[PDB]
Amino acid sequence: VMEDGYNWRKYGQKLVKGNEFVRSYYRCTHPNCKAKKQLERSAGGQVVDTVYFGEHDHPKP
DNA sequence: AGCCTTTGACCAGCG
DNA sequence: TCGCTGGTCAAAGGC
Ligand SMILES: [Zn+2]
């Protein structure tokens, strides 16, 4: 729910590390842009980490 | 209508 | 080999 200035579309969600956390997978909405992030929530909905892969081919919108 | 989640299937690296 | 764990796909539904 927090923002970092980019547009992400969610392409999956999975339970990990023995149903302890749940991980959400997003990729950047800008065309041809291969950047993906994932973010990983605690059982209480609190966000633990955020993982960024790659870089955008466009600047911040 | 055109974006967006959600959800289970699919699949691939690895133990 | 085999089954587990995680990453993605595609089909549906919501706003
Ligand atoms: Zn991008």
Domains (range + CATH), chain A: 1-61 (2.20.25.80)
CB A6 within 8 A of CB A28: yes
Please list the helix, strand and coil fractions of chain A in percent, rounded to the nearest 5, in that order. 0, 50, 50
Q: Who's near A8: CB < 8 A, 6+ residues apart? A: A26, A27, A28, A29, A37
Structure-determination approach: X-ray
The residue behind tokens 């081919």 is A57
Q: Is A58 annotated as a binding residue?
A: yes
Q: Which residues touch strand C (CB under 7 A)?
A: A 11-12, 14-18, 23, 25, 36, 38
The edge-to-edge listing of strands for the beta sheet with A36-41 is A8-16, A21-28, A36-41, A47-53
Q: Who's near A41: CB < 8 A, 6+ residues apart? A: A21, A22, A23, A24, A47, A48
d(CA A3, CA A13) in angstroms, rounded, equals 19
- A7 CA distance to ligand 1 middle (Å): 8
Nearest in space to A30 (alpha carbons), one of A12, A54, A9: A9
Burial A13-37 (b: 16+ CB within 10 A, else e): eeeeeeeebbbbbbbbeeeebebeb
Q: Is A28 annotated as a binding residue?
A: yes
